[PDB]
Design a protein around this ligand. Structure first.
Ligand SMILES: Nc1ncnc2c1ncn2[C@@H]1O[C@H](COP(=O)(O)OP(=O)(O)O)[C@@H](O)[C@H]1O
Length: 399
């Protein structure tokens, strides 16, 4: 079964590659590769290689010496004076680094994330190569759509390489949720490009609860995640962003610990009222008001004949959970949500779905999808109706 997971991963990557070919590159990846190899000097090949195998140089956990060297580079050669103690043996792995447990000079236990020394050069060389390739596509692939791709690559790369960015996001959240009854965000103790230090917290990882959690653990951490999702933009005008179980844990006192803030998305105006409004109107099947609301919001394409059945299908995954007091998010239900209402053999229609959502709607809907999927993995019972009434603008009965 370990095989099947990787097979699914491979299938997903294949699909997204095909998506890139059809919606972006305007040619197959192999053909594009031939063009790129012709259109990019071989002289740029060997540096790109040499930039990439220092990262290959110490693949397993870094020996103490190299750890201390990174610390030298980021906090100075006297970095030890800032600690009470430091464990040379890493306790966890990060995407491009490793995490150590230590004790800060004030006596607080801390997690210290140390970036691999060869990560910066490698990732930036990779970025350069992909920039060149985008150039090749833009100039030589007829009908290619590479709009905004370079910017996305640069932004992603910088978010991975400069720890201070995520550190700043985390500071915002740590300030907002200090002494909160249900959420715990560790404070940032120190931040540098390649080293970031924060208060140590540990509980039961959400992944562990997904695998072997009790019903009560599942329900609780699920309900907490759901709450955070709508509370954060209301509280500090920010959304925690696309969720992953690795970001969260259940603490002994029943609070949810949150440790990853690399996907924080800006929402200055809070959650758009159009969303909650749309869900309420859809529950009531008030299509007369629902369709103009969705069109104005940009949730459906303007000036199109739309199918009410398709609208119902479109909003089903949002409507069904709030039709009950406590909804049981399950994989079974989520699977039912993928079963299309309209067979293409019955009727050939173009979808009413907006494939170019406004940003203000696109971001929260994406995060909500990720969260919902996680709730289904958790098999969590969640009072999403009440949470929506209290936290989501426009959802409660407007009387
Ligand atoms: N504040 C913290 N307290 C305890 N452990 C932490 C803390 N921050 C990170 N970790 C450990 O580090 C691991 C990865 O950290 P993470 O923030 O996900 O790094 P990255 O996002 O770069 O992968 C986590 O699985 C967790 O066990």
């Amino acid at each position: 079964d370990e095989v099947t997971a990787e097979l699914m991963e491979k299938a997903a990557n294949q699909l997204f590659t095909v998506l890139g070919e059809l919606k972006g590159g305007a040619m197959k990846v192999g053909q594009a590769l031939s063009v790129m190899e012709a259109a990019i000097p071989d002289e740029f090949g060997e540096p790109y290689r040499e930039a990439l195998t220092k990262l290959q140089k110490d693949a397993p956990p870094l020996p103490a010496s190299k750890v201390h060297r990174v610390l030298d580079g980021q906090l100075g050669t006297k970095w030890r004076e800032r600690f009470s103690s430091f464990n040379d043996t890493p306790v966890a792995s990060a995407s491009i680094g490793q995490v150590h447990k230590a004790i800060w000079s004030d006596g607080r236990e801390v997690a210290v994330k140390i970036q691999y020394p060869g990560a910066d050069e490698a990732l930036r060389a990779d970025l350069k190569t992909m920039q060149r390739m985008v150039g090749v596509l833009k100039q030589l692939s007829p009908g290619a759509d590479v709009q905004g791709v370079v910017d996305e690559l640069v932004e992603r790369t910088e978010m991975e390489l400069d720890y201070r960015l995520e550190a700043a996001n985390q500071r915002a959240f740590a300030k907002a949720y200090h002494d909160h009854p249900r959420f715990q965000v560790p404070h940032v103790v120190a931040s540098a490009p390649k080293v970031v230090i924060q208060e140590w917290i540990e509980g039961v990882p959400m992944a562990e609860i997904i695998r072997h959690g009790t019903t009560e653990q599942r329900d609780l951490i699920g309900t907490l995640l759901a709450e955070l999702t709508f509370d954060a933009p209301r509280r500090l005008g920010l959304m925690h962003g696309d969720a992953h179980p690795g970001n969260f844990m259940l603490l002994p006192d029943g609070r949810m610990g949150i440790i990853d803030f690399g996907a924080v998305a800006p929402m200055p105006g809070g959650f758009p009222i159009e969303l909650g409004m749309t869900i309420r109107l859809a529950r009531e099947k008030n299509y007369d008001l629902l369709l103009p609301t969705m069109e104005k919001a940009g949730l459906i394409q303007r000036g199109r004949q739309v199918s009410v059945r398709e609208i119902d299908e479109m909003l089903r995954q949002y409507v069904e959970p709030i039709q009950v007091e406590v909804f049981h998010y399950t994989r079974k239900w989520l699977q039912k949500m993928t079963v299309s209402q309209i067979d293409r053999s019955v009727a050939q229609i173009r979808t009413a779905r907006q494939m170019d959502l406004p940003a203000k709607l696109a971001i929260p809907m994406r995060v909500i999808a990720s969260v919902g999927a996680i709730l289904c993995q958790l098999d969590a019972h969640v009072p999403i109706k009440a949470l929506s009434e209290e936290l989501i603008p426009g959802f409660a009965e407007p009387d």
